[PDB]
């Protein structure tokens, strides 16, 4: 009784799941835990059980882009996952303030996908669980890692054309901090299925004009903290 | 140099502002503080300086509905206000779980207004500041008052007709907790102007099928806590 | 058996109602009638029975903005009101032609609200009753007061930002005369509930780059004329 | 220097124009005037100069549907026409009240076209000139012909399918009286170009479940009345 | 048992129909066939039975614009027509490449109408039948007539205003070749009713900055080829 | 000078590219060619040079979903690819007619993504190149493999919820044949960048109520045929 795309079973699903885009990132994360168990690898979806600080939680890759990741997240959320934290990279939308390697823990997101709109009307917020956000922030503080907080623009467009103007500049003026491609989708799906979500991101560019290791530490720390509550 | 609709001046604006819909509610709130100073009353917008736990903060009425309240909130946000907490009433969207007199502290809202859409594209979240939410929650806990947390549906429609179906049932299924008329507007305006916002509401009905005093205590407590940081 | 927000009863509702935004305006209007009876004051909604030229009609304040005023107008329309005329202020959209203190009697309006869209699809016109418009015009003429006629832009945005362009310039080029915030809402609600509506406005600004007394006279005149038909 | 589709020249354009859909209707109208002059016939656009009650005005066919008629109306409005009255047939949207052969003089219309939306944002009303409406009504009264007044639903769909529900039932509940295909387009174009418009229609069906001659008389009467003002 | 607007009967409908906008074009086409039979002329809809290369097919005029032509096309498609090819004129959207008199055979179209949107959601393509396109192309080649291939922008706006920008420039950059007013409507209706459609157009202008006879030959050739299959 | 996500270089890009969703599918395809060269594997994007019938063309995996695949397709289209054919699986939208294992070669698609809408207005068709479609069809015929032809619904939603109705039933009634998740995106991107595209799909389910090998043969055959033209 395996999940259709993750090819893992319901019993293999822990309460806390760390998600990342790249299956290769799962491999670099697992070796930084105390131990791990490889579970499956199907398409872009790679699943490993991570063991860290006496706690147990999966790390799963979701692929690039909202529709791809919705299949991952739906399979998790409908099969016992209670907390999903996305860790990844992003573009800065405030290049004067937030620079290469800076880390942003996000509370909400702009819904520039389609799938969330196929699930619920556009007016509904893409918003993470406060507790997951508080936990992520507290782990950062404990490790003395400075971080930013803010809204991420989640967009299905990576390569713009020159016909329809990009809204990234509008959202920068609206004080959105960063840009990526899956957080909003995660948050809407999460909310609809009673799954607590959050997101922590490392800036690796700007669309306009050691830190990684720390980001990962923060994310694994938050997962261990959250996991403790369900064990 | 008075504000056009609030008829108060920039110097009279404290860092923290409590907002409520009804000017009569301002009067019932002020007398529960240690002392107060009546500042102005113009149209539906009543402003009083509240004194509570050694702290100083305004209580301002915003009127019914999103466009009316946007004029209030814009005048505050553009003239020195740093934290705005809305306190009011709402309908329950989960009548089995959340009942008459229950109190909900909200993290985000559904944007069923127009004014927010005239300010920023629909995909952008209506989301409150986490710190304001954490503060509100902590005051509740300190007073041993149980509370719910969740998304509020902010709608410009109070009296439905029978032509266009209401989305309230959709949003209830999407796990939105409550319904009111101004929170989303507050949150978008707040975000756009770098003003930290939040909302605490008391259930007084359902669109489908002592506690007040406690709500007010929580709200005044959070305002005093937040105010301390800027004095 | 009181109306929920107006706090008046069905029997207190006359066939003709004059509506204005500001409760203070009700007070300045009532004293210009032959006599009056104060009925209620709840939130921003102030109701007074006006007596003028042997006729009987209410003057009710509706607050600022479309959602707020929809609660007022729905309570009136569902409880026996047959004719509602809004009197108020507006911005000029044709500053070369229509200046400070000029009076505009409006036949239709731009629906830049939300509530009307929650009632009926966007394609439907916001249009006043011709008879109410003809009456308003005829009273103006009788008093030898010059007036303009045209479409009003009804917008939920008073304070623009600099992200999303305002449509006010588009509508000025489309030959819309004035701008305000509630007429469209009135007209749609009116049409949906078989209530005859209209609007007369005095210019008090421009968003781009004695007369009051006369406006009020015109409005009270039209109300007396219309009221005569139902008594 | 002929108009591109009407194949008439600017000098041949009178201040008042009667428009109808069918070129054959122009022929049946012209012979009921005192005299006439055939001007042109190109595609569906037939133009004749009508002479009636000592007055001079064109009767022009506009074809079926909004985009077709917009070319007619734009050529008229940009080349000296001041008043355009559409006369035609329609479906009843209130079959209990308004029956086969009843005549409706319309004040406004539902914009279920595209071309008007390519000219101006959806929120803007399709509304006729009050004076043209008053004139049409007064001619009816003079001839003792009973008439209805109301909003027409102007739709680009004549033959519905069974996938997307028709809004005709919604608009019937919204108290729209009749349905046709060009009035809204006329009214928007009219408003944008400072041309006074109106519409008088005879019911010839229902989408749900002697009089002609009188309609035509009313229309020719109104044209003669309006024309007198510019001669 | 006549069709309501075409005024022909079901038995008079051939499997292949050539459609054109102008009823006068039907007259110039019929005389180029081997023989013909005039069937009807009602409003802008002129129907003639064409006889060419031993084959039998109608030529029908559809009028200007999408809503008008939808009535024509629906009456054909619901009454036995299997193949509809539109032949007409268009504007070039690539003036450097495609010039006056050049001929474009179109595979798909931009849906800038309303009626198609009243039939099926905007996301659905306006696309012709490949076989009809292949046939049209092969007839061109047989007659050694050079042709272009591409998407046509079908727009309900002929005369732009200066408020809402035209999308024609956007679609030119998107590599749309030509512009006209009815192809998209034909293609959607065709697809919905299982009718095979296509379009061949001759450039006669640009919105920016012998060949006819050949176009007609190509169109009559394709109709004869297609007709052979059903006889 | 490697492509950012494909991690191949411009010189490694052939004129014809076969694309598939699953990187594992690339592996099963390559071994069926005469020979191959593994080029790269980064994230879900696996690239191999295929050698077949004396011809040279890449096979590249694009991942699940529209936004993910747009990064793949944009990198190809902007770096020398002239023909992209997608081969994959789909759901049947006509379960009576089109069954498990049946193969559909698609001419156009429904744009239920977001990224295409961020590139060009919704009215623009998602349509493949006719020549690629003709080639695919001819290879099928040569191998005596029966196939269907039609429109695919491309949707970003795989797992529906029960709040917002799925349009799949609407599109089935509109005669769309199949459903998948990337074809529309491919086709729009293709059209915008002057890249010829197409799609061949094998039915493996229905959302309502040997053949593989043949599909692959057809796809490799079409790629070899198309490649011959550029070598
Ligand atoms: O989402 C991450 C990301 C996205 C985008 C955006 F969507 F705006 F173009 N920009 C990114 C940037 C950018 F340079 F800011 F543009 C840097 C790092 C990651 C980015 C990447 C997207 C490609 C796949 C990996 N995630
Ligand atoms: O926003 C509060 C409120 C709104 C609405 C809604 F918008 F859904 F109809 N319902 C409320 C309810 C309701 F009964 F749940 F419907 C109770 C108490 C306050 C409500 C009120 C609205 C009227 C003015 C005072 N705030
Ligand atoms: O609706 C009236 C009004 C509105 C607006 C608009 F919505 F465009 F900004 N502009 C007004 C102006 C303006 F100056 F034209 F902008 C003058 C007087 C009244 C105005 C005011 C709005 C604030 C509350 C009282 N009614
Ligand atoms: O606009 C007139 C008309 C339209 C429509 C509608 F658009 F709803 F289907 N219904 C009509 C009806 C109808 F029967 F009510 F449906 C009767 C007479 C004229 C009608 C006709 C439409 C066909 C061309 C002549 N005008
Ligand atoms: O559709 C044909 C057409 C349309 C348009 C457009 F819709 F863009 F304005 N432009 C055309 C042009 C134009 F000059 F390119 F603008 C030339 C020839 C026919 C055109 C004409 C439209 C008027 C009625 C006859 N078909
Ligand atoms: O796009 C293919 C596909 C999609 C969908 C849809 F989007 F409707 F749900 N349904 C599919 C079906 C379905 F069973 F018809 F629902 C079968 C096989 C592939 C399908 C799959 C989607 C998951 C990732 C692989 N492609």
PDB file of C-alpha atoms in Angstrom, chain A residues 16-219:
ATOM      1  CA  UNK A  16       7.349  16.027  11.061  1.00  0.00           C
ATOM      2  CA  UNK A  17       8.673  16.198   7.478  1.00  0.00           C
ATOM      3  CA  UNK A  18      11.395  18.370   6.155  1.00  0.00           C
ATOM      4  CA  UNK A  19      10.864  19.121   2.435  1.00  0.00           C
ATOM      5  CA  UNK A  20      13.366  20.433  -0.104  1.00  0.00           C
ATOM      6  CA  UNK A  21      13.292  20.823  -3.818  1.00  0.00           C
ATOM      7  CA  UNK A  22      16.297  18.888  -4.989  1.00  0.00           C
ATOM      8  CA  UNK A  23      16.674  15.156  -4.341  1.00  0.00           C
ATOM      9  CA  UNK A  24      20.473  15.799  -4.080  1.00  0.00           C
ATOM     10  CA  UNK A  25      19.804  18.120  -1.175  1.00  0.00           C
ATOM     11  CA  UNK A  26      18.200  15.198   0.710  1.00  0.00           C
ATOM     12  CA  UNK A  27      21.482  13.281   0.365  1.00  0.00           C
ATOM     13  CA  UNK A  28      23.541  16.247   1.778  1.00  0.00           C
ATOM     14  CA  UNK A  29      21.078  16.678   4.606  1.00  0.00           C
ATOM     15  CA  UNK A  30      20.860  12.984   5.626  1.00  0.00           C
ATOM     16  CA  UNK A  31      24.662  12.636   6.194  1.00  0.00           C
ATOM     17  CA  UNK A  32      24.551  15.623   8.612  1.00  0.00           C
ATOM     18  CA  UNK A  33      22.060  13.782  10.845  1.00  0.00           C
ATOM     19  CA  UNK A  34      23.186  11.243  13.459  1.00  0.00           C
ATOM     20  CA  UNK A  35      21.966   8.412  11.184  1.00  0.00           C
ATOM     21  CA  UNK A  36      19.438   7.737   8.412  1.00  0.00           C
ATOM     22  CA  UNK A  37      17.436   5.174   6.478  1.00  0.00           C
ATOM     23  CA  UNK A  38      16.929   5.507   2.691  1.00  0.00           C
ATOM     24  CA  UNK A  39      13.236   4.745   2.022  1.00  0.00           C
ATOM     25  CA  UNK A  40      12.556   5.450  -1.711  1.00  0.00           C
ATOM     26  CA  UNK A  41      13.418   7.377  -4.812  1.00  0.00           C
ATOM     27  CA  UNK A  42      10.793   7.788  -7.541  1.00  0.00           C
ATOM     28  CA  UNK A  43      10.882  10.519 -10.117  1.00  0.00           C
ATOM     29  CA  UNK A  44      12.082  13.713  -8.322  1.00  0.00           C
ATOM     30  CA  UNK A  45      10.653  12.536  -5.016  1.00  0.00           C
ATOM     31  CA  UNK A  46      13.432  11.176  -2.696  1.00  0.00           C
ATOM     32  CA  UNK A  47      12.461  10.073   0.852  1.00  0.00           C
ATOM     33  CA  UNK A  48      14.876   9.325   3.730  1.00  0.00           C
ATOM     34  CA  UNK A  49      14.212   8.843   7.452  1.00  0.00           C
ATOM     35  CA  UNK A  50      16.455  11.245   9.405  1.00  0.00           C
ATOM     36  CA  UNK A  51      17.621  10.597  13.001  1.00  0.00           C
ATOM     37  CA  UNK A  52      18.685  13.642  14.900  1.00  0.00           C
ATOM     38  CA  UNK A  53      18.909  14.600  18.591  1.00  0.00           C
ATOM     39  CA  UNK A  54      17.144  11.334  19.541  1.00  0.00           C
ATOM     40  CA  UNK A  55      14.256  12.212  17.200  1.00  0.00           C
ATOM     41  CA  UNK A  56      12.818  10.681  14.004  1.00  0.00           C
ATOM     42  CA  UNK A  57      11.560  12.652  10.935  1.00  0.00           C
ATOM     43  CA  UNK A  58      11.524  12.315   7.113  1.00  0.00           C
ATOM     44  CA  UNK A  59      13.363  14.496   4.644  1.00  0.00           C
ATOM     45  CA  UNK A  60      11.525  14.404   1.249  1.00  0.00           C
ATOM     46  CA  UNK A  61      12.396  16.183  -2.071  1.00  0.00           C
ATOM     47  CA  UNK A  62       9.341  17.871  -3.791  1.00  0.00           C
ATOM     48  CA  UNK A  63      10.788  18.912  -7.173  1.00  0.00           C
ATOM     49  CA  UNK A  64      10.750  22.243  -8.853  1.00  0.00           C
ATOM     50  CA  UNK A  65       7.493  24.165  -9.006  1.00  0.00           C
ATOM     51  CA  UNK A  66       4.077  24.335  -7.471  1.00  0.00           C
ATOM     52  CA  UNK A  67       2.143  21.532  -9.309  1.00  0.00           C
ATOM     53  CA  UNK A  68       4.937  19.049  -8.838  1.00  0.00           C
ATOM     54  CA  UNK A  69       5.288  19.841  -5.188  1.00  0.00           C
ATOM     55  CA  UNK A  70       1.506  19.720  -4.622  1.00  0.00           C
ATOM     56  CA  UNK A  71       1.562  16.021  -5.450  1.00  0.00           C
ATOM     57  CA  UNK A  72       4.304  15.469  -2.835  1.00  0.00           C
ATOM     58  CA  UNK A  73       2.537  17.605  -0.199  1.00  0.00           C
ATOM     59  CA  UNK A  74      -0.907  16.145  -0.774  1.00  0.00           C
ATOM     60  CA  UNK A  75       0.487  12.604  -0.420  1.00  0.00           C
ATOM     61  CA  UNK A  76       2.150  13.589   2.856  1.00  0.00           C
ATOM     62  CA  UNK A  77      -0.776  15.559   4.284  1.00  0.00           C
ATOM     63  CA  UNK A  78      -3.389  12.937   3.494  1.00  0.00           C
ATOM     64  CA  UNK A  79      -1.227  10.156   5.022  1.00  0.00           C
ATOM     65  CA  UNK A  80      -0.358  11.281   8.542  1.00  0.00           C
ATOM     66  CA  UNK A  81       2.086  14.193   8.330  1.00  0.00           C
ATOM     67  CA  UNK A  82       1.310  16.904  10.931  1.00  0.00           C
ATOM     68  CA  UNK A  83       4.191  19.411  10.378  1.00  0.00           C
ATOM     69  CA  UNK A  84       5.933  20.194   7.069  1.00  0.00           C
ATOM     70  CA  UNK A  85       8.817  22.636   6.896  1.00  0.00           C
ATOM     71  CA  UNK A  86      10.225  23.630   3.598  1.00  0.00           C
ATOM     72  CA  UNK A  87      13.900  24.515   3.440  1.00  0.00           C
ATOM     73  CA  UNK A  88      15.403  26.019   0.351  1.00  0.00           C
ATOM     74  CA  UNK A  89      16.836  28.811  -1.646  1.00  0.00           C
ATOM     75  CA  UNK A  90      15.363  32.096  -2.828  1.00  0.00           C
ATOM     76  CA  UNK A  91      15.930  35.385  -4.510  1.00  0.00           C
ATOM     77  CA  UNK A  92      16.065  38.573  -2.462  1.00  0.00           C
ATOM     78  CA  UNK A  93      13.349  41.159  -3.128  1.00  0.00           C
ATOM     79  CA  UNK A  94      15.041  43.803  -0.897  1.00  0.00           C
ATOM     80  CA  UNK A  95      18.711  43.706  -2.206  1.00  0.00           C
ATOM     81  CA  UNK A  96      19.766  46.740  -0.032  1.00  0.00           C
ATOM     82  CA  UNK A  97      18.659  44.966   3.123  1.00  0.00           C
ATOM     83  CA  UNK A  98      18.781  41.187   2.449  1.00  0.00           C
ATOM     84  CA  UNK A  99      21.900  39.806   0.714  1.00  0.00           C
ATOM     85  CA  UNK A 100      23.526  36.592  -0.584  1.00  0.00           C
ATOM     86  CA  UNK A 101      23.598  33.972   2.209  1.00  0.00           C
ATOM     87  CA  UNK A 102      21.069  35.709   4.429  1.00  0.00           C
ATOM     88  CA  UNK A 103      18.398  33.470   5.807  1.00  0.00           C
ATOM     89  CA  UNK A 104      14.695  34.314   5.910  1.00  0.00           C
ATOM     90  CA  UNK A 105      12.075  32.498   7.946  1.00  0.00           C
ATOM     91  CA  UNK A 106       8.673  33.174   6.283  1.00  0.00           C
ATOM     92  CA  UNK A 107       5.249  33.626   7.813  1.00  0.00           C
ATOM     93  CA  UNK A 108       3.125  33.816   4.647  1.00  0.00           C
ATOM     94  CA  UNK A 109       3.416  33.861   0.874  1.00  0.00           C
ATOM     95  CA  UNK A 110       2.104  35.319  -2.368  1.00  0.00           C
ATOM     96  CA  UNK A 111      -0.030  32.790  -4.289  1.00  0.00           C
ATOM     97  CA  UNK A 112       1.380  33.176  -7.833  1.00  0.00           C
ATOM     98  CA  UNK A 113       0.656  29.523  -8.645  1.00  0.00           C
ATOM     99  CA  UNK A 114      -2.376  27.823 -10.132  1.00  0.00           C
ATOM    100  CA  UNK A 115      -2.890  24.732  -8.007  1.00  0.00           C
ATOM    101  CA  UNK A 116      -3.766  26.703  -4.847  1.00  0.00           C
ATOM    102  CA  UNK A 117      -6.357  28.578  -6.898  1.00  0.00           C
ATOM    103  CA  UNK A 118      -7.798  25.173  -8.007  1.00  0.00           C
ATOM    104  CA  UNK A 119      -8.127  24.323  -4.322  1.00  0.00           C
ATOM    105  CA  UNK A 120      -9.524  27.577  -2.851  1.00  0.00           C
ATOM    106  CA  UNK A 121     -10.513  31.073  -3.988  1.00  0.00           C
ATOM    107  CA  UNK A 122      -7.743  33.613  -4.524  1.00  0.00           C
ATOM    108  CA  UNK A 123      -8.753  35.782  -1.536  1.00  0.00           C
ATOM    109  CA  UNK A 124      -7.635  33.152   0.973  1.00  0.00           C
ATOM    110  CA  UNK A 125      -4.189  33.669   2.524  1.00  0.00           C
ATOM    111  CA  UNK A 126      -1.147  31.509   2.081  1.00  0.00           C
ATOM    112  CA  UNK A 127      -0.034  31.571   5.734  1.00  0.00           C
ATOM    113  CA  UNK A 128       2.208  29.265   7.776  1.00  0.00           C
ATOM    114  CA  UNK A 129       1.553  27.966  11.323  1.00  0.00           C
ATOM    115  CA  UNK A 130       2.819  30.456  13.946  1.00  0.00           C
ATOM    116  CA  UNK A 131       4.162  27.760  16.189  1.00  0.00           C
ATOM    117  CA  UNK A 132       6.341  26.349  13.383  1.00  0.00           C
ATOM    118  CA  UNK A 133       7.560  29.906  12.706  1.00  0.00           C
ATOM    119  CA  UNK A 134       8.267  30.537  16.388  1.00  0.00           C
ATOM    120  CA  UNK A 135      10.185  27.265  16.649  1.00  0.00           C
ATOM    121  CA  UNK A 136      12.289  28.038  13.579  1.00  0.00           C
ATOM    122  CA  UNK A 137      13.076  31.471  14.971  1.00  0.00           C
ATOM    123  CA  UNK A 138      14.013  30.157  18.367  1.00  0.00           C
ATOM    124  CA  UNK A 139      16.444  27.619  16.916  1.00  0.00           C
ATOM    125  CA  UNK A 140      18.069  30.380  14.973  1.00  0.00           C
ATOM    126  CA  UNK A 141      18.486  32.449  18.108  1.00  0.00           C
ATOM    127  CA  UNK A 142      19.878  29.507  20.088  1.00  0.00           C
ATOM    128  CA  UNK A 143      22.584  29.043  17.466  1.00  0.00           C
ATOM    129  CA  UNK A 144      23.179  32.802  17.344  1.00  0.00           C
ATOM    130  CA  UNK A 145      22.369  32.929  13.651  1.00  0.00           C
ATOM    131  CA  UNK A 146      20.912  36.204  12.519  1.00  0.00           C
ATOM    132  CA  UNK A 147      17.818  35.902  10.316  1.00  0.00           C
ATOM    133  CA  UNK A 148      15.194  37.980   8.513  1.00  0.00           C
ATOM    134  CA  UNK A 149      11.478  37.410   8.668  1.00  0.00           C
ATOM    135  CA  UNK A 150       8.882  38.170   5.939  1.00  0.00           C
ATOM    136  CA  UNK A 151       6.605  37.221   3.099  1.00  0.00           C
ATOM    137  CA  UNK A 152       7.929  35.220   0.153  1.00  0.00           C
ATOM    138  CA  UNK A 153       6.635  35.691  -3.336  1.00  0.00           C
ATOM    139  CA  UNK A 154       5.947  32.192  -4.641  1.00  0.00           C
ATOM    140  CA  UNK A 155       5.988  32.302  -8.418  1.00  0.00           C
ATOM    141  CA  UNK A 156       5.469  29.685 -11.173  1.00  0.00           C
ATOM    142  CA  UNK A 157       7.643  31.853 -13.510  1.00  0.00           C
ATOM    143  CA  UNK A 158      11.441  31.534 -13.269  1.00  0.00           C
ATOM    144  CA  UNK A 159      12.368  32.843 -16.755  1.00  0.00           C
ATOM    145  CA  UNK A 160      10.418  36.019 -17.559  1.00  0.00           C
ATOM    146  CA  UNK A 161       9.563  37.135 -21.125  1.00  0.00           C
ATOM    147  CA  UNK A 162       9.089  40.756 -22.202  1.00  0.00           C
ATOM    148  CA  UNK A 163       5.375  40.896 -22.972  1.00  0.00           C
ATOM    149  CA  UNK A 164       3.670  40.600 -19.577  1.00  0.00           C
ATOM    150  CA  UNK A 165       5.393  42.580 -16.837  1.00  0.00           C
ATOM    151  CA  UNK A 166       6.616  40.585 -13.798  1.00  0.00           C
ATOM    152  CA  UNK A 167       4.899  41.518 -10.484  1.00  0.00           C
ATOM    153  CA  UNK A 168       8.143  41.003  -8.525  1.00  0.00           C
ATOM    154  CA  UNK A 169       8.800  44.759  -8.434  1.00  0.00           C
ATOM    155  CA  UNK A 170       5.206  45.412  -7.198  1.00  0.00           C
ATOM    156  CA  UNK A 171       5.629  42.845  -4.409  1.00  0.00           C
ATOM    157  CA  UNK A 172       9.048  44.290  -3.435  1.00  0.00           C
ATOM    158  CA  UNK A 173       7.329  47.627  -2.948  1.00  0.00           C
ATOM    159  CA  UNK A 174       4.644  45.827  -0.936  1.00  0.00           C
ATOM    160  CA  UNK A 175       7.505  44.734   1.366  1.00  0.00           C
ATOM    161  CA  UNK A 176       7.712  41.100   0.306  1.00  0.00           C
ATOM    162  CA  UNK A 177      11.226  39.933   1.251  1.00  0.00           C
ATOM    163  CA  UNK A 178      12.068  36.979  -0.961  1.00  0.00           C
ATOM    164  CA  UNK A 179      11.003  34.962  -3.952  1.00  0.00           C
ATOM    165  CA  UNK A 180      10.757  31.274  -4.575  1.00  0.00           C
ATOM    166  CA  UNK A 181       8.372  28.745  -6.092  1.00  0.00           C
ATOM    167  CA  UNK A 182       6.598  26.425  -3.644  1.00  0.00           C
ATOM    168  CA  UNK A 183       5.901  27.937  -0.242  1.00  0.00           C
ATOM    169  CA  UNK A 184       2.500  29.327  -0.962  1.00  0.00           C
ATOM    170  CA  UNK A 185       1.359  25.968  -2.309  1.00  0.00           C
ATOM    171  CA  UNK A 186       2.639  24.244   0.769  1.00  0.00           C
ATOM    172  CA  UNK A 187       0.865  26.713   3.074  1.00  0.00           C
ATOM    173  CA  UNK A 188      -2.534  26.549   1.329  1.00  0.00           C
ATOM    174  CA  UNK A 189      -2.459  22.758   1.113  1.00  0.00           C
ATOM    175  CA  UNK A 190      -1.324  22.679   4.801  1.00  0.00           C
ATOM    176  CA  UNK A 191      -4.176  24.909   5.943  1.00  0.00           C
ATOM    177  CA  UNK A 192      -6.802  22.977   3.952  1.00  0.00           C
ATOM    178  CA  UNK A 193      -5.652  19.599   5.430  1.00  0.00           C
ATOM    179  CA  UNK A 194      -4.954  20.753   9.007  1.00  0.00           C
ATOM    180  CA  UNK A 195      -1.176  20.428   8.559  1.00  0.00           C
ATOM    181  CA  UNK A 196       1.116  22.889  10.251  1.00  0.00           C
ATOM    182  CA  UNK A 197       3.658  24.343   7.838  1.00  0.00           C
ATOM    183  CA  UNK A 198       6.559  26.721   7.603  1.00  0.00           C
ATOM    184  CA  UNK A 199       9.494  27.765   5.487  1.00  0.00           C
ATOM    185  CA  UNK A 200      13.144  28.788   5.932  1.00  0.00           C
ATOM    186  CA  UNK A 201      15.132  30.023   3.037  1.00  0.00           C
ATOM    187  CA  UNK A 202      18.659  31.056   2.095  1.00  0.00           C
ATOM    188  CA  UNK A 203      19.145  33.941  -0.408  1.00  0.00           C
ATOM    189  CA  UNK A 204      21.225  32.906  -3.462  1.00  0.00           C
ATOM    190  CA  UNK A 205      20.484  35.727  -5.924  1.00  0.00           C
ATOM    191  CA  UNK A 206      18.373  38.743  -6.785  1.00  0.00           C
ATOM    192  CA  UNK A 207      16.038  39.183  -9.828  1.00  0.00           C
ATOM    193  CA  UNK A 208      16.703  42.903  -9.955  1.00  0.00           C
ATOM    194  CA  UNK A 209      20.074  44.662 -10.129  1.00  0.00           C
ATOM    195  CA  UNK A 210      28.901  28.509   6.229  1.00  0.00           C
ATOM    196  CA  UNK A 211      25.482  30.263   6.007  1.00  0.00           C
ATOM    197  CA  UNK A 212      23.964  27.238   4.208  1.00  0.00           C
ATOM    198  CA  UNK A 213      25.169  24.850   6.923  1.00  0.00           C
ATOM    199  CA  UNK A 214      23.637  27.179   9.522  1.00  0.00           C
ATOM    200  CA  UNK A 215      20.319  27.237   7.623  1.00  0.00           C
ATOM    201  CA  UNK A 216      20.268  23.407   7.606  1.00  0.00           C
ATOM    202  CA  UNK A 217      21.164  23.252  11.306  1.00  0.00           C
ATOM    203  CA  UNK A 218      18.244  25.571  12.060  1.00  0.00           C
ATOM    204  CA  UNK A 219      15.875  23.450  10.002  1.00  0.00           C
TER     205      UNK A 219
END
